[PDB]
Amino acid sequence: EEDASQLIFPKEFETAETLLNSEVHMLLEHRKQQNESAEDEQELSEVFMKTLNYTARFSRFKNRETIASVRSLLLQKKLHKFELACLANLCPETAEESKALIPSLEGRFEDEELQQILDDIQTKRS
């Protein structure tokens, strides 16, 4: 029954806080910077390294202010939290591609209304 396509999740996960690829990337980078210092400490594990090299290959923007602006210009809408991560991470070109990938956008908003948002997201990319 758990299918994110139809916007359904358990009660505990419904009250979660979404994270973007750049956000998690910078969080892990800061954690690594803090951990590497303060000698006599247990070093990072393979999980941290794989997550780092996985999120580093999808960092659409390095500036934190870019993350702040792209979340601010998005939260003003009426979309759910789930629509804040996938759409901000994939960064599709045209509205048709976004509507095809995410079935929730089908009929939820107009065409130009989503195309302008996609163009803004593309421009915000570094």
Binding site: S37, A38, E39, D40
Partner: protein, 267 residues
Amino acid sequence: NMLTKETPETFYIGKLIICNVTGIAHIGVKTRLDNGVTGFIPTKFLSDKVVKRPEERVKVGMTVHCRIMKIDIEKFSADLTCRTSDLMIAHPSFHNINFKQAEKMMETMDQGDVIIRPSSKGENHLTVTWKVSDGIYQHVDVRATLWINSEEFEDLDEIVARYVQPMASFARDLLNHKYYQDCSGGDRKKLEELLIKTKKEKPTFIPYFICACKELPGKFLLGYQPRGKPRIEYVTVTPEGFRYRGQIFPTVNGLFRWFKDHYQDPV
């Protein structure tokens, strides 16, 4: 190579090869190696030719590590060297020691020479001892609960220059005081009679003295005689300055200047 399975090509010079000495024919100790090679240690490996066989340099019956300087697995030879060498003002010192024995090397250095040594209470702890006076030494047991971080463990060249050097200078400032005395480490029984023996010679003028205790280092004794009754008042020397009546002064002279204007009250 077909039988032993260990040719001289594998064993190189300089690499330490264990030569298990199990027996000796005449003078040396000819034993077996790890790879089934007859390791014959000549008299040169042990330094014994016309004397008792080398037992301290070559382990008889067991395996003794030595520098491998000969590949003679096929020839039933093992040029393993039995010798260990073959295998191959403000003076902060160091110590890679107990407490009773450490005191034997503290009375020679002059004031200001700080020495760092491990602790003897727990783990990952250190104790900084700095020369205070003749026989008085403060053993700051850093976990004198001096709270610090862990990054300082790498470089220890600033903990003494940030908390010991200024404190040491302030403590030494009192050593050169005009009215200074020791009285056998400043005992409570000997420092009281002096106050009553010195007042009779000058009842009008009430002088003062300063001394540091021996059982509790870091607590000076500033006594005075307001009347015919003695009184004692301790004072602590903090890293930044002093701690008299709860106040902390920046300079050493500040405490003296503030003390000569507050002892007139009836108390």
